[PDB]
Amino acid sequence: DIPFDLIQERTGVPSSRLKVAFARGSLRLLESAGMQALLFKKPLGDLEAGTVIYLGDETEVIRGFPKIRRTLLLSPTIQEHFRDRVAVEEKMNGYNVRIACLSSGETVALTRGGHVCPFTTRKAQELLDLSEFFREHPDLVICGEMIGRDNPYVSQDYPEVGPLGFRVFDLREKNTNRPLPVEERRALLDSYGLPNVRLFGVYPIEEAASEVADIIRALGMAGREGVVMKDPSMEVPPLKYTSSQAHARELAYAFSYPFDFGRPFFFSRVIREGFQAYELDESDDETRERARRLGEAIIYPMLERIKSISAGEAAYEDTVIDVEDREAAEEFIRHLVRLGVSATLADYRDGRATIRRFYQSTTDRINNYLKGGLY
């Protein structure tokens, strides 16, 4: 049975609360070299969502990666939130991964919710040389973004990393979740040959907003996602800020499968565009480009989707990935399915699996309308 009291001492969450939690968002699972793990789907006390506790020779709390706050404006918000200096890292468009070495010496890659992903743990070890780092720092958790075209979760091609890559943006302690300061983190990771996310600079607080404005303009025309701004000593939480092109990219994806996104969502992205227009557009022409960009990002993917379904095609997206074998592919599919993803293996050859994700809500509703169903 579950050692609630032990968990209570390691988490600061009273055993009573943890039994309340078990009614719903606290799940026991068998995970890693035959070990028993408690996964927190919801925050609870200081424990972030996706926190996972491994019940090994010793008990290890792999804390959830904390939510990062968003700002819609650079000024006065940056000066209002930070103090003295701001570190500005690239926000990579991928999926969040925590890599930890457990007490058993087994290495684990956790998705945001706390599940071990068979695809990700394998690509982590294939792509990263982790052995020396974990021998010297076993109680540090490597927090990074898994990115690439051949990414089964969020596919964006970052040609300077290859078809699939990884970039580290945090080192956090087991149990406490305490982050290393920015510059020390980057240097440490360098000395062990691990890859850091791009850092644009560390700027004096009075110059930071205008520096980010330039950076964002640059990222925008390259189609990169945006920026994460950080207190160099991590005593003040980070802020994220994204580019107009990132918003159009998300909105176009969303209006390609309009009924699979929990309605807004949508309003959230458009509001970003309003405040950004207010702050960053330096001519009417620029605002009219922004308008056009937004209109087409919404209309055309929708139009094509409806056209496509009209012609008999179900809504789906394919991603081709590396797998160990067809069995590994299938195991990954099961993992996606239990996450609530409608997925199947659509093709397989060698170690290349075509993962097909279905968007049935969009297929159903657009079909029903096409057949005379009423709004």
Choice between 20 and 306, CB closer to its own copies: 306
Among 2, 20, 29, 73, binds its own copies (CB under 8 A): 73
What is 213-282 written as a DSSP string?
HHHHHHHHHHT--EEEEE-TTSSS--EEEE-HHHHHHHHHHHTTSTTSS-STTHHHHHHHHHHHHHHH--
Instruction: Give the interface segment with its own copies, choosing from 14-22, 87-95, 158-166, 271-279 (CB under 8 A).
Output: 271-279
Cβ at position 365, least distance to its own copies in Å: 9
Query: Does residue 27 interact with its own copies by CB under 8 A?
Result: no
**Residue closer to its own copies, measured from CB, 288 or 334:** 288
Q: Would you say 51 and 12 are in contact if contact means Cβ atoms under 8 Å apart? A: no
Interaction between residue 236 and its own copies (CB under 8 A): no
Comparison of 266 and 348: residue with beta carbon closer to its own copies: 266
CB of 281 to its own copies, least distance (A): 8
Looking at beta carbons, which pairs linking 78-84 to residues 24 or more positions away fall under 8 Å?
Answer: 78/205, 78/208, 78/209, 78/212, 78/229, 78/239, 79/205, 79/206, 79/208, 79/209, 81/236, 81/239, 82/205, 82/208, 82/229, 82/231, 82/236, 83/205, 83/231, 83/236, 84/204, 84/205
331 is in an annotated binding site: no
Residue 96 annotated as binding?
Answer: yes
Q: Is residue 84 a contact residue for its own copies (CB under 8 A)?
A: no
Q: For residues 208 and 78, give the distance between their C-alpha atoms in angstroms, rounded to a whole number.
A: 8
Nearer Cβ to its own copies, position 131 or 310?
310
Question: Of the candidates 293, 323, 332, 359, which one interacts with its own copies according to CB under 8 A?
Answer: 293
Residues 359, 362, 365, 366: what is their CA dihedral angle, to the nearest 10 degrees? -130
Nearest distance in Å: CB 298, its own copies: 6
Contacts to its own copies by CB under 8 A: 69-73, 76-77, 79-81, 239, 255, 258, 262-264, 266-268, 270-271, 273-275, 277-278, 287-288, 290-296, 298-300, 302-303, 305-307, 310, 369-375
Q: Which residues are annotated as a binding site for ATP?
A: 68, 70, 89-92, 96, 112, 145, 169, 240
